[PDB]
RNA sequence: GCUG
DNA sequence: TCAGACTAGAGCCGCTG
DNA sequence: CAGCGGCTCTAGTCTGTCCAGC
């Protein structure tokens, strides 16, 4: 019902406890939180002026399923009704990066030789080389 | 001082090699990009738009307005091409039956041709032999396709390769995931294993998982054909210097010069191009509007149909909600047919220095003679080149001029190509200034070799050459002994006359 | 100077059928290849000999006679080792202009290499002092056609000494 | 043009063409069906085999391979209808010898 | 794969010459072709074709075999020619795994193609001594020690036995004592070892530092007992894992055993089939991250979650608006990442159907991006081909006005920005090509 | 008419771009070798020369190029550390 | 197929405007000029 | 539609 | 209007293993 | 006992039907 909402304002609020991560030491298993994330979702996040102070788990879990697609923890045991193992872990990027300026341009893909878009004189590599 | 240059490089055609342009060679021929749908400006000045069709950078088809690219008139200009960008790829309807053939030969997963190494070597050896006929190449292609159509697994990647076949007008389908009474293969089971959420919102998906099959389409087959190895392209019988598999699907389209499609009834060929331009703009707007995929598919299908109709307007399988209300000339319809370029403009064509009249008998003529009326003889002229034997004869003909029968209509100077119309000026001055090498277009006179022909010709004797003799009455006349070759009967019959305009054409007419 | 073997298809118009071919081709080929530099070849001058003249066709159009002609023509092309003798037909401040005597006024020497008293100061000073000799140094020709000069040379003057004239 | 109203002229049909072949009349068939109808010249580039204009080839961006060929205009028209169909007639030209 | 052949024309042009490229690239274009047929079709004289094939068989790019006609048909393997692009990377990991001596061993083995032991140790006795102190001469015995030390870990394998066919001539291939036997480098062992760096960087930059090292020591003790065609590594026990740990670690057996059952049970999964299958999707995801922002990358990961559930959930499962989302789908469609609507089962109707569902196909999006990355290095080299021939006037002046020198340092900034960028796209090739080779049966 | 103005654009600018010269530190090592072997592969024995220049030159003359410590000890060890196939 | 068409045949000769081989086109005419082939050369 |  | 000699399919039965 | 394969058969479809004049 809440189409007049920007969850992109709330995506950082459900992210910043997973960037800090006190006790990164490996003294134990470090089976990591999803219930406290549901706990911080219900009473109070970081501060924001919010019209939907009513707290349902069906409207609050959806910000996670976007943020898994923004590289954050998978679901462990959500088969339970309210309380089970629910293991989670924020995924740091598994690769570096892999591209170049010429990987960005769709129209500049056409060329194949010195032509109208020949790469011997493209603007993009001229921009990248300074 | 000056550099050497050859004066006049006349050459002789040795062969025509047919082929196809790649989409990025089209951009190198074409002089402009065409983007605008409107044929004309709205205001009363009646100019065409700068970047739409009818732009005079692509030539001209009226003497009133010159071409922009070379600044030359209709008579001097060869014409120049533009291009249209297409936002989605489309099948070319002439190459469509060849697109399926390749997809029956190549593996759909890694684009290698599905043949054993020994089979590939045998086919390469058949290609290697010199003197191969065009029929032999077509026969070889059929054999290669048959061997591929009997294999169901690729020797190179291992992926399954079911049947490729047509599934309606300009659509292709591939049975990559067939179902059998025997235990289902893992890949097909994995493909439909768990679309539970899709099943929940779509009732039709759950009952017949097997029916859904790989819908090949221009966005996929263009991506396959870029990946076919150049070693395997000769075994598709494509000549790799005339074209590539990638060139079949077209993401670009040339628009012909204006002289191919002249500005006057009211031109509708330009409207067909405008419809394609309008659809491309609409499809881009729909993508910006975030319209549903089915709406995008319908717009894309319309774009494919319009391009196919533009190349050929005679397609059989057009759905009722897409059929043209009116018939229109596609390119194929102006090539084919009796009025088509091959028969109407090439095999048989209208000729000048020709005449027609009723025929009537005259037995006092010899069998090699035909009476030509003065009204035809004053019109049908022969270019007599001035030389030492005829200078004093042609002077008297120039003096008589256009209105007296042994006379002349035009005079032309030695190294000049304009013609002085001899009705004006003082002809006794133009007769004195005859030089050797001038051309006098004298009237037809007694002893001209003239061709004579009845309209239906069943044998060679229906057209013969006769010596003209000028006589006052309007009919063509010949001795009735020559009625049997022409099958003429003097009952208001008409016959044709042709005046050969060349000395070499006189001799071949007279002797043969 | 160097001979250049060339092959041309020479068209004799049919009002010259009285004259002998090897003469009447030669009158045409002089009108085809005189005072004309051929790119990468040199400045053609005249006709040396016609080494092979083959048979006179007559084509389905013209009625003229087209004989393919092998010949040799003398051309002008310095060999990058020639000390020529010309005349200064012009002096520019960037470099002198020498001309071979009524041959071609198109040889343009750049002047940087003679003795350290070198300038042309626009009052037609040849050289600040201590027929004219020339060393042709590079071949340089530019094909003219480009849209809908040409043998220029660069010419040197080293420490020759020039005993007769400075 | 087509007829008497338009001062049209007369047709050498496909059947009259068959008559003239049987006489062996090769030059008369060239005079009637090329010279006195639709004689034309095209610039042909010997490198790519396409048609050009004014001694210039836009495809190659060069001026040196272009040559003039005597062609019927209806065949030039055919060679531009076919390219828009993406059937490319790439010509090769020898000298006339 | 025409852009692949675009590179083999570029790679031979810069390294050896032009006719060795031409006769080379034609052989890639027409395949199993005899000696006289190659010289007639490329328009090359037969003396130069015999030399050009002689250099090509030396660097192991063209392989010859006769079957029936008694006439040898040469044949060039395409994928070997692109491995020249990885050549300085093949140098570097022999510096991390061996000394400067053995790093020079794989260098002149990659450079001069086929080498005997009696030559390659004699050559590095020249190069390493001329850079070391005179009078402090490097002793060649340590070279022969590290020469076999490469071979016990099987980084250098020997050439297959020569056919010695009558058409083939023995005297021409060697360049001018003992004969010995020849070898190339085992670059296939590198493609394991480059994959060994790939998985250990995949775990360390995702899980933890201590998780990756036990993957490394698992794979370091499974080198000879597998090959590249192994679907996964040889199975090991956890007790020899505690034996094979490095001496830098001090972790107790039972805590790492908890991490061992942690690392065995992941979404990542040592399953070498799943390892390159998971690393390839991150290479895909790092390209949409490179190109279409994090918003389109968010729906790109959504189709890797659900196979065929699309356009009735993708407006909901990412919460981005319908206008902004549907341009990201059609841009993922038009650039062939989103693959297609393989679920429509209503008959022949774009308007009336069972609703087309998007679905990523991982290999069609793989083979395109590999074809794209082959196209990419064509635009890299040709620029460095472009900027070279102009500036040759001032390279020899050092061997000079202020814009003259400034053009050189903008050249040398450019070339070093180009040549470094040939390698950063090169690591995307191998990361995807090893995924290509892992899903290809019967090869 | 909405697009009938000019060539769409001389170029289309993508609001997001390339990241950087990625992997900045360590490819200084490979990057010099890119230029090192290219200095040595061109100046190698395994290359060809333009003998078409010399057949093009009819100006051949004299005085031009157109006209004109390994400290080691013996040993012998031949290892089969490698494959025994093919 | 990328087929190349020989312009030798009768029908394509009439299309292209070149004279057909059969009939009067089968042979060539040489002019009987008073010529001396391989003429005396100027000695160097 | 008719003439050819 | 009237074939008409192509192009896939649906089988079919019976050896072909 | 089962599976290619060619046969064999429907039947499906696209392709022509003189020259010319007004
Ligand atoms: S350089 Fe060549 S390839 Fe790289 S972007 Fe510009 S055009 Fe496309
Ligand atoms: Zn024009
Ligand atoms: Zn395959
Ligand atoms: Zn061209």
Author numbering:
A (entry chain P): 186 to 315
B (entry chain A): 3 to 266, 275 to 522
C (entry chain G): 2 to 131, 145 to 162, 184 to 201
D (entry chain B): 1036 to 1132
E (entry chain O): 2 to 177, 229 to 321, 336 to 465, 491 to 534
F (entry chain Q): 21 to 88, 102 to 119
G (entry chain A): 1334 to 1377
Q: What is written in the article reporting this PDB entry?
A:
By contrast, termination of Pol III-mediated transcription occurs when the polymerase reaches a stretch of more than three deoxythymidine nucleotides (poly-dT) on the non-template strand (strandNT), suggesting a Pol III-specific termination mechanism. In Pol III-mediated transcript, the productive elongation complex (EC) is converted into a transcriptionally active but metastable pre-termination complex (PTC), a key process of transcription termination. Human Pol III consists of 17 subunits that are organized into a catalytic core (RPC1-2, RPAC1–2, RPABC1–5, and RPC10), a stalk module (RPC8-9), peripheral trimer (RPC3, RPC6, and RPC7) and a dimer module (RPC4-5). The cryo-EM 3D classification revealed two distinct conformational states, which represent a PTC and an EC, respectively.
The strandNT exit tunnel adopts an open conformation in the EC but a closed conformation in trapping of the strandNT in the PTC, suggesting a working model to elucidate how Pol III efficiently mediates transcription elongation throughout target genes and specifically terminates at poly-dT. Structural comparison of Pol III EC and PTC shows well-ordered strandNT within a narrow exit tunnel in the PTC and an open exit tunnel in the EC. In contrast to that in the PTC, the strandNT is highly flexible and could not be evidently observed in cryo-EM maps of the EC from our study and others. Consistently, the protrusion and the lobe are separated by ~14 Å in the PTC but ~18 Å in the EC. Notably, residues K430 of the FL1 and N228 of the lobe in the PTC spans and binds the phosphate backbone between T−2 and T−3. No such interactions were observed in the EC. Structural comparison of Pol III EC and PTC shows a conformational difference in FL2, especially at the DNA-contacting motif. In contrast, the DNA-contacting motif tends to be flexible in Pol III EC and V465 is positioned away from the bridge helix, possibly due to the lack of stable contact with strandNT. The disruption of this contact leads to less stabilized FL2 in Pol III EC, as evidenced by the weak cryo-EM map of FL2. (I) In Pol III-mediated transcript elongation, regular strandNT has no specific contact with the exit tunnel and easily passes through the open exit tunnel, permitting an efficient strand translocation.
